[PDB]
Amino acid sequence: GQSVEVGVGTLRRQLEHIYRIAPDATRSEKDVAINAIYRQVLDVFAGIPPSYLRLSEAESKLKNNEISVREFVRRLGRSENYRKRFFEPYSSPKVVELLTKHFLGRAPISQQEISTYVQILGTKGLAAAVDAIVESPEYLTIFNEDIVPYRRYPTLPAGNYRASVRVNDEELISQSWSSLSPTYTGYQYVTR
Amino acid sequence: MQDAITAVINNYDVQGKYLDGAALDKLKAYFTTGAVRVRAAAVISSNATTIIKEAAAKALIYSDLTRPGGNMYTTRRYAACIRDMDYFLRYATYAMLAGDPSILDERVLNGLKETYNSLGVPIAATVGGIQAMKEVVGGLVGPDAAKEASIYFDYLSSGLS
Amino acid sequence: MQDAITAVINNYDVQGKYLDGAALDKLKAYFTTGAVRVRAAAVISSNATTIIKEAAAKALIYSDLTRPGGNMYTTRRYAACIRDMDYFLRYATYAMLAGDPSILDERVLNGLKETYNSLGVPIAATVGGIQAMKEVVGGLVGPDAAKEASIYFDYLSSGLS
Amino acid sequence: SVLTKAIVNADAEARYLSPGELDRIKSFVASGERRLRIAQTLTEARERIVKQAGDQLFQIRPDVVSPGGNAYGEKMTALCLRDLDYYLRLVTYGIVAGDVTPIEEIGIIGVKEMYNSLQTPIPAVAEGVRAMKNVATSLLSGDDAAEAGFYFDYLVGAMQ
Amino acid sequence: SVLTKAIVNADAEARYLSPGELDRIKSFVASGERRLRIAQTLTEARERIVKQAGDQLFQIRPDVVSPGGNAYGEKMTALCLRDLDYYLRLVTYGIVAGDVTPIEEIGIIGVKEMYNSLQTPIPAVAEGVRAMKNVATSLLSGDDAAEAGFYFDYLVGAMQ
């Protein structure tokens, strides 16, 4: 007999949290929530950047409630720190599905969409593509003005559950973003 | 991506070598052709639209491709095709400025062969669209730049076939 | 993921069994070691950085690995490597608290062997980095916890090889 | 082919062919159109399959591209991928015919003796072929990927 | 380079290079031979430069080379000058590229984390670099010394 673990897990609903923020509500709570934005959006699997890219003035804008979580996420999407590390090295087709996931938690839906975003990256560039998503109906209903985005595994579109399982939490990020000094590969071993 | 100059720097960095005579000679061979690359890019950019129109006219339209059953039938697909053409032209202009084809691999060729197989996009017909734009480009840019522009169009087209 | 308390429940649920004597004995065997797991985690967490430093010093740096041509050459890659090391240490600490290796499979090992093959990351050298952190950990946590911490480092390292 | 194999067994017995053998031929004819299509698909991506096979190989066995390795150096590596290109070609031939036949005569009978002379490590050639299976198989539908996979595993088998 | 930087901004906005971007490529390439001469001179005196930096460093911070110092001892000092040799090399790369892309990926991004682990005092590495500026700059004409100096002050800046 199959256990509770056998179908669609049980370890993934536990692992998905919804963080909101509560304007008048503690630094620590703010921090963890803020840290999760970084983890979902720029991959950061260890969940925090060695005081990197980050958000000087970005953090004060999000807290203060000057900016709302949706907005902060949109700023984060169009930035140098992001362009380099996810669009610096990829033809026009896998960068689109990667921009999709981080911000919609998935892969491209159908062949008709490999068109809407490829033409927006075609002509208006990366910044416009980021905005196209943060403002779509799908983004809005699911995480609206203030839910930090999370991984999804959604059931519905057909084929999308298995694609989603594969794009996120099954196949990680390869390829070093920078092109500066290739890794040589003839030396697996550390004998001494 | 990398250009002529960073191609050399990264090749030496992995050996941890300061640039030596052989390296310095390569970089000179790039710098000495640099002004000509710039002039050529300004011709291509400013004639972009005319190059696509003359390349399509010689190699794509007035054909079964643009007729019902053809892949560039429908205003939708005709638009997608000449959109693509603009990508090729524009990126080849980047490759030629950089003096390195690496950008054509990273941002254009990777997965494109199979993408075209999956949509049904005719590969051989697309290559002719590339080699027709090269033909036009080589006239417009002149003796100075003709060979140098040409190679990155040829890089593109053997990348698909 | 699952832990010793949770695993006992899901292992019985699939058989639709109440927890019986055999189950209750297993859970006791976990609870009875629980306080020691907590103390050990507090030592590892608070010495995290020193464990990585001493493990790298015994098993990675002062070598061809850190020299030009080596995979942990460049500040970029050196940073990525000790970043990885922190993951291993941190997750092994989770596995040991949970008393179950399932988290090491779900969130660390799955696809990692091939990821390292694809980037060129030296597997054997990474295992030594794991088994050096274990060595340090086993000193710091003491008789109480040494064997229990150790196994999840050994789980990690036979997961790559 | 399937034809050659059936016939040779028929003639050896000196009697016309009989219902079964015939059934296999009929299956092969229907299969051949699909088989021809798979070979064409494999042929289209040959350069990508070889190159990515070659990376997958040298990670898994870096020793062949090392001081005392058969494929050590730029032109000892160039010939190595060329041999990988040879075997992918033979795999397309095998698929199309429906029987392995010609590939055997072209590239396994005598292969031990050839590579022993050159001192090439045979089992790492078998690995290069597994690596090609992995790449080629990711460009084919489930059903066609299996049909192709049998011929890859044969070559892997014969180098043994 | 200047090329890489210009292009990346071009491609990211889906456009051809600006008049500005074209102008800087032109001014940059005109300074090619000069930049190559600046790198040559410094490459030619590398062994002298690191040491004079190394003397200037140990006077200013005799402690680093003291009981509880990161560079205390003969081989903890040998590695320290080797790191100074590394950064001078990267400075020659930067000068010929006309920007920091290469300098940055190779030796500043991740440098805080590396040296914090080794427990190396970062600000005294910045001093070692100032010391190299002083020596290198005394082997170059006024105009070339300034052009070089920008790249030294960048590294000093990034370790901060």
Binding site: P182, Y187 | - | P68 | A78 | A78, L81
Partner: peptide, 30 residues
């Protein structure tokens, strides 16, 4: 001939089969 296979010296975004020829080794000197 082996000309098609030859431009495979470019390897990947950054994949070179092992060991980058002569490599300076300055540790003795330091």
């Amino acid at each position: 001939p082996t000309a098609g296979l030859e431009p495979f010296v470019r390897m990947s975004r950054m994949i070179r089969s092992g060991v980058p020829e002569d490599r300076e080794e300055p540790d003795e000197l330091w």
